[PDB]
Write a protein that binds this ligand. Structure first.
Ligand SMILES: Nc1nc2c(ncn2[C@@H]2O[C@H](COP(=O)(O)OP(=O)(O)OP(=O)(O)O)[C@@H](O)[C@H]2O)c(=O)[nH]1
Ligand SMILES: Nc1nc2c(ncn2[C@@H]2O[C@H](COP(=O)(O)OP(=O)(O)OP(=O)(O)O)[C@@H](O)[C@H]2O)c(=O)[nH]1
Ligand SMILES: Nc1nc2c(ncn2[C@@H]2O[C@H](COP(=O)(O)OP(=O)(O)OP(=O)(O)O)[C@@H](O)[C@H]2O)c(=O)[nH]1
Ligand SMILES: Nc1nc2c(ncn2[C@@H]2O[C@H](COP(=O)(O)OP(=O)(O)OP(=O)(O)O)[C@@H](O)[C@H]2O)c(=O)[nH]1
Ligand SMILES: [Mg+2]
Ligand SMILES: [Mg+2]
Ligand SMILES: [Mg+2]
Ligand SMILES: [Mg+2]
Lengths: 429, 435, 435, 429
């Protein structure tokens, strides 16, 4: 009932997915072999949303894993937790895009996109009632940004009356993993804005602050870093997977948090985050969860709200815990931080409560907030892009694969246009 | 013999109905599975009797999302309900009145109407409808509008009572709450005989102060609202020294075609340890019920004037002391009635004392009072909601969603002007006028 | 005493008859082997008693292919049937009307007639014939049309009732149904007293929706068919307060020699777990049977008029509420009779409650309603089917298989205009006329 | 009861039969020696249709294996499964036809055809009630194509009121096994059209793709290649060999699928196909069978139905399975694919259901659809033939053994006429 399809593109998508489906397996009590070994029957009431029943109590997931190079699939296939995927889903190419937009959207993406479009259509008909699409990709590389944008356009035209969520990874401001970051970003965003519904802008080095400071980890590896991304990934969509006193769903969030079609760039956040040694000295209660959530320190995007305002906010609590203090504390946050909210949107808070606590924790909360602070996130990217394109650098081979100089004209003329309304609304009266 | 049917819409409706039907089962001495170990008719008003000794409710549970209905199916009340009535769609309206009223709402309305017609033709002396629905919920508001229109079209002149869930002024859980409220109120202003209001923040204040509970989950609030529902219905369900009916309620509360928005109150609401140190006399419970800190809508009647009042006493009661308490409250200064209503009181008495649920927050009582007041203190709530809606709509937020889901601008404009006129008329009637 | 024989032809008839005769032994308490553990005749109209304690049926199983009859011999109902009657050929007709009517029909038609005169002389008060034949197939359409010519001449004026299997509009097992149907109807239009129509796609909806079964195999579907079959002859085999014979419906439901195409319907049809929560009263099963979602042919009666009706109750039924429930149906406006039929109902009652076969989908029930309404809604069934055949004959598809097997092109034209004549007369009589 | 006669001509017919009768042996549970070793008596109720009961509970096939060269019989006789055939049936010549039409029709076929007709007549009288003939030949070789039509004419004249089916192997478009492909094909088909009730046009390389894509077998040998042909062969005739809820017979298929005498060229199809490794992750459920059956790529003929329309479509299900879903599914297939069906034949579907599953599978289905896409198959052969015949290439070797120039005139004047009628029906109104 209300199934959603998981799509993974780029190297991050499989790396995030390899740990994402680890989390879902533990929640539903699924052994690595793929056989149910759980005890509670509440988890099996709604199991079709993510997994699919198969012959002899098999539970293969509804996952599509696609990459341009075989260097990522061999890891998940040969490694553990690869025995439950269906090998038909393991779509792979021959060579990577090489961090090229054209080599991920025009030249080689034409023949690969036709193969995946078959499997997703095959998966869609197998579904009972499709609810939406859940996509994971990177905005910095070529395969994740290039084809993933192309796949969205093809999915959008075939399924116009359906919702989709993109858990994109915004390029890090302070550190640049790839030399050519701005060129990939602006080309993807210019095509993403008009053909998507709701995106979660997370950051790479912003995650580094939390694990090093809040979790007090000295060597944060990608295994631990991706684990935090999974927690805020399994919490947003846990409302329809489990019962609750005030339920939510994928469409419910999109109605409350998208005032305008263009303004659909979000900011996630997770709480609580306590280390193994320092968790004995903190009373896990409802009060501190909201306080530990709204502060600029525990935020998953490299943005300071102190320079901006919160347009809308949605908090998805979990675990067995009463609701009276949820609103009385939300009112206190609304009153104490009253200078940090938009005036022409009253009571701009949405709340929802689940029933099943996360593994090894009594209660937790997930915060997603549409804020104006993203305005400076795009300006920094736009400032970097407009400097390099003026020198006409690195584009001597971009034109070699079909794309042309005039393509830059519209991409840049909209990012400054998008940020114009993204900012003029903040001071609008 | 006089049959009333209950329609529960939305998750709030389903949970409130679960609590209410639990309370009915304890009241009529029926086990959850349908068997049983003044009394017997009473249950024939609600519990239709089947071939065997089982009794089945006259409830119509309807929802779009299937999760809450799955929960109520899996609950301990799985045998009692007739499995056909539990009507579920596939996806919820997601706090979109447009979705809940136009797009998906028309694909299940036929089935719910068919079941309503089947149940209404099954009974003999049908009395009316009790609709348990919320206001913030998109499915709740959309199905409220659609079902009001359809039932008014089908059955001409019957009682249509609603137990709404008013949006709280400070407590808030939605963002499209003003839009849902304005649209549903404009649509169902002309298609309801008498609509009660209940607010969650007020119930939370009541449970915090009067009952002194620090962990007030939704169960306690649902228990309270179910207690008010049972108290208002005990007049039909039981015999008393002075009976009262739903038509009596309407004709004694609502004086005008539009001014039909009363508010409910219950008494006594005291804890378990405080029960031993209290007397529970008729006069003191009457004063407690009229106390402004016990009303279940976050509006203090001191800012307005009472216009009509109905009180149902149940248990051991003497009409003389009832009369004395009513007279002294009438002569009290702070309570102020309207000039053109020299008699603003309607009293009913019932011989059945209320019964407390096992494990409940309340304590056993021998006397109970339910109060229903049509006043002008709801005008401030209407004005506040209208101001919030106008402020939100001044720059066209979420209008793209609403218009894309089959709407226009005339609907918003006419709802705004309609509630402006309604508030103006409410204030003009409530305020004293020369001659 | 008054005897009727049943002719089962084709795998449709044999499979239906396998469960059809399954029910009679249950009704009359007959063990599959013929032994025994109202009563005492009951079985003398169907079960011709032999010298020993065994009772043998009065059925004539006939088919062209030896496949479907084989499992009947090797099934659990092996000893009951008399081994002579199971007439089998060597090869089927391959959905070819020509093969089953001209080439291979004649070489075996003389063997079935021999067993008919053998069994007709064995009985004393022979009443009529029961035919269980489909339309799409070859041995079920061409071969049975040969019988209608052979039985008619041998026995001038007796009852000839057919329980056909109407081809479905959307559902289509075969590819030459428009060729078999029109050829069958034209020849057997004038040699049938009344032909009860049954569609295959309609029973899926009844089983899926009313009974809520997700796996409706032919075993469960054919079970729902034998109930009407055991219902039409439920008054011959049992004593009732108001009895009906096979000439009653034949006289009450045939206003004109051509318009003799009624359609069956059964009630109540409810599940096992839903049985405990249903009152199951005479007042509702009259309404439950009449609803357009319960008929066993995919033709909604709302599009047309009810030419006539016929009801056969049973069990603990009192003739007052039957009078009451039937009377209020004329007031309700989902029914629409013709002007020249002011009285248009027939009622029959019986004292034997229906019995459910163990392992079946139905639950034990104390009442039963089986409506047989001749109505104008079947006019659309011929016109819609006539459109399909008229499209085939435009370019003479599949014709070469028919012409070379012993029929002429001219014979096809006559069957085409005959359905136009029937459709014109049936609509013209059904529609109002001046003066 | 309604016995069937199996005729095998050419090397392919012997090789196909060498594995075909393996499939029949497993279904009816006979040992390689020839003695029944089964468990269920449901198999022996109809055993005379294919096998023949002999003294001391021994069964022998009702098949004749004939070729112009002794190499093929030497393999089957010396190898296993040669001890159950009656040695009389093993007819062999002295030398192969050498891929020559005349040598397989006039010179070396005249003396052999008299010997085989004796065994045909002898076997027919041993039969109780003859139902038809099954013939397996090749349209590219000499002996299979040359004599095969010669035996058809001899059988046709002496049994006129009888049906027969030919499982012809159409030459591959992409690869030509023999240099002179077109000359054999156009001469045989012109003689095939006049006196053949129904033919199954299968291809060789079109089956190469099926094994390579689904079975993911890197090296498809003829041992495994012919196995899928046998399953299609066994699925057609299992209806009268086993009980069914809705039976079909060889006479039912012909009348349902032959609107006109000249239009009896078919396209087979089998489903499901799943490799051993990937069969655990697929739930064998009736909805997936029909969808896997109708897709253009999973076809046993090298002709995509996208460029054509389905005249009529058959489906022969197998195994225990409910009847409702197959009934309603083909409506959904008809509704979704409504643009690919002939307008003047509505409800153009024949459905049949058996009651015994295939070995090692819960259920299966077989598709036989008379499509217009055959039109493109004959046009290529006609185009290839008319190009070579203009140059008179290889002609001087054919005319030296009986044939002559104007013999080719009618064969070509029939193909373009047949393909014209085959074409002027899809566009006809
Ligand atoms: N959150 C997270 N991000 C990662 C991780 N590994 C890589 N990334 C991000 O992914 C980006 C890599 O680019 P990709 O889109 O994967 O490109 P690719 O898969 O190497 O293919 P090419 O574009 O052709 O080079 C880097 O810029 C990182 O920011 C990871 O483990 N966790
Ligand atoms: N009194 C009371 N109110 C409740 C309860 N649960 C939810 N509500 C109210 O119901 C509102 C939510 O709207 P719902 O009708 O439940 O919406 P839904 O059921 O999720 O369906 P959609 O409107 O389509 O999203 C909240 O604003 C609450 O005020 C409850 O247990 N008791
Ligand atoms: N109600 C019902 N109908 C059936 C059943 N089995 C087959 N049919 C119908 O019978 C039709 C097939 O035509 P038949 O007359 O049965 O064909 P046949 O009896 O095998 O004789 P031939 O046409 O010569 O093959 C199908 O279209 C089905 O609708 C059954 O078990 N129940
Ligand atoms: N499907 C299938 N086809 C085969 C197989 N082996 C050979 N063939 C086909 O058979 C054809 C060979 O022609 P044949 O009719 O067998 O000729 P022959 O038996 O060698 O005798 P000559 O014609 O005199 O050479 C080739 O073109 C192949 O297409 C096989 O194992 N499977
Ligand atoms: Mg890469
Ligand atoms: Mg909801
Ligand atoms: Mg047959
Ligand atoms: Mg050879």
């Amino acid at each position: 009932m209300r199934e959603i399809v998981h799509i993974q593109a780029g190297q991050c998508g499989n790396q995030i997915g390899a740990k994402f489906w680890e989390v879902i397996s533990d929640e539903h009590g699924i052994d690595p072999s793929g056989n149910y070994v759980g005890d509670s029957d509440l988890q099996l009431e709604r199991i079709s949303v993510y997994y699919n029943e198969a012959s002899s109590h098999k539970y293969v997931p509804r996952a599509i894993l696609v990459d341009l190079e075989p260097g990522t699939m061999d890891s998940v296939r040969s490694g553990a937790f690869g025995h439950l995927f269906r090998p038909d889903n393991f779509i792979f190419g021959q060579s990577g895009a090489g961090n090229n937009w054209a080599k991920g959207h025009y030249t080689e993406g034409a023949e690969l996109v036709d193969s995946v479009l078959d499997v997703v259509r095959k998966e869609c008909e197998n579904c009972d009632c499709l609810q939406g699409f859940q996509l994971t990709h990177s905005l910095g590389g070529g395969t994740g940004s290039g084809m993933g944008t192309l796949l969205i356009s093809k999915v959008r035209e075939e399924y116009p009356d359906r919702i989709m969520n993109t858990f994109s990874v915004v390029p890090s401001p302070k550190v640049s993993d790839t030399v050519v970051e701005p060129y990939n970003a602006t080309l993807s965003i210019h095509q993403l804005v008009e053909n998507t519904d709701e995106t979660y802008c997370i950051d790479n080095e912003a995650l580094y602050d939390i694990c090093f400071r809040t979790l007090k980890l000295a060597t944060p590896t990608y295994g631990d870093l991706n684990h935090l991304v999974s927690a805020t990934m399994s919490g947003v969509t846990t409302s329809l997977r489990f019962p609750g006193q005030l339920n939510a769903d994928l469409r419910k969030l999109a109605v409350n948090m998208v005032p305008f079609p263009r303004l659909h760039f979000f900011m996630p956040g997770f709480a609580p985050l306590t280390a193994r040694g320092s968790q004995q000295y903190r009373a896990l209660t409802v009060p501190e969860l909201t306080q530990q959530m709204f502060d600029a320190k525990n935020m998953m995007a490299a943005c300071d709200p102190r320079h901006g305002r919160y347009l809308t906010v949605a908090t998805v609590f979990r675990g067995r815990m009463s609701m009276k203090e949820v609103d009385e504390q939300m009112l206190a946050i609304q009153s104490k931080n009253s200078s940090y909210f938009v005036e022409w949107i009253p009571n701009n808070v949405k709340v929802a409560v689940c029933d099943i606590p996360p593994r090894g924790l009594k209660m937790s909360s997930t915060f997603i907030g549409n804020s104006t602070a993203i305005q400076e996130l795009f300006k920094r990217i736009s400032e970097q892009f407009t400097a390099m394109f003026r020198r006409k650098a690195f584009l001597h081979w971009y034109t070699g694969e079909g794309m042309d100089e005039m393509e830059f004209t519209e991409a840049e003329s909209n990012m400054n246009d998008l940020v114009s309304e993204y900012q003029q609304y903040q001071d609008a009266t | 013999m006089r049959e009333c049917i209950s329609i529960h819409v939305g998750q709030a409706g389903v949970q409130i109905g679960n609590a209410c039907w639990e309370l009915y089962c304890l009241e009529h001495g029926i086990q959850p599975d349908g068997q049983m170990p003044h009394h017997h008719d009473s249950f024939n008003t609600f519990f239709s009797e089947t071939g065997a000794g089982k009794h089945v409710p006259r409830a119509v549970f309807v929802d779009l999302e299937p999760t809450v209905i799955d929960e109520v199916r899996t609950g301990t009340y799985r045998q009692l309900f007739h499995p056909e009535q539990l009507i579920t769609g596939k996806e919820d309206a997601a706090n979109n009145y447009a979705r809940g009223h136009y797009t998906i709402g028309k694909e299940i309305i036929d089935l719910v109407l068919d079941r309503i017609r089947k149940l209404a033709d099954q009974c003999t002396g049908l009395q009316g409808f009790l609709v348990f629905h919320s206001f913030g919920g998109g499915t709740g508001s959309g199905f409220t509008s659609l079902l009001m229109e359809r039932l008014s079209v089908d059955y001409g002149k019957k009682s249509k009572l609603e137990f709404s869930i008013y949006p709280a002024p400070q407590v808030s859980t939605a963002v499209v709450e003003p839009y849902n409220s304005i649209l549903t109120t404009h649509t169902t202003l002309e298609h309801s005989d008498c609509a009660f209001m209940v607010d969650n923040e007020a119930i939370y204040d009541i449970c915090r102060r009067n009952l002194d509970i620090e962990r007030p989950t939704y169960t306690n609030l649902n228990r309270l609202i179910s207690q008010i529902v049972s108290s208002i219905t005990a007049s039909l369900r039981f015999d008393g020294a002075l009976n009262v009916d739903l038509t009596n309620f309407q004709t004694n509360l609502v004086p005008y075609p539009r001014i039909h928005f009363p508010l409910a109150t219950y008494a006594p609401v005291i804890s378990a340890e405080k029960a031993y140190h209290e007397q529970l006399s008729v006069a003191e419970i009457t004063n407690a019920c009229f106390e402004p800190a016990n009303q279940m809508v976050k509006c203090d009647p001191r800012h307005g004037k009472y216009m009509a009042c109905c009180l149902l006493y149940r248990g051991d009661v003497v009409p003389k002391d009832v009369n004395a308490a009513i007279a002294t409250i009438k002569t009290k200064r702070s309570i102020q009635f309207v000039d053109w209503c020299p008699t603003g009181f309607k009293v009913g008495i019932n011989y059945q004392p209320p019964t407390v649920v096992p494990g409940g927050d309340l304590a056993k009582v021998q006397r109970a009072v339910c109060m229903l007041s049509n006043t002008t203190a709801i005008a401030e709530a209407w004005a506040r909601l209208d101001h919030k809606f106008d402020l939100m709509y001044a720059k066209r937020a979420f209008v793209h969603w609403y218009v894309g889901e089959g709407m226009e601008e005339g609907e918003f404009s006419e709802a705004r002007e309609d509630m402006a006129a309604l508030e103006k008329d409410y204030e003009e009637v409530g305020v004293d006028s020369v001659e």
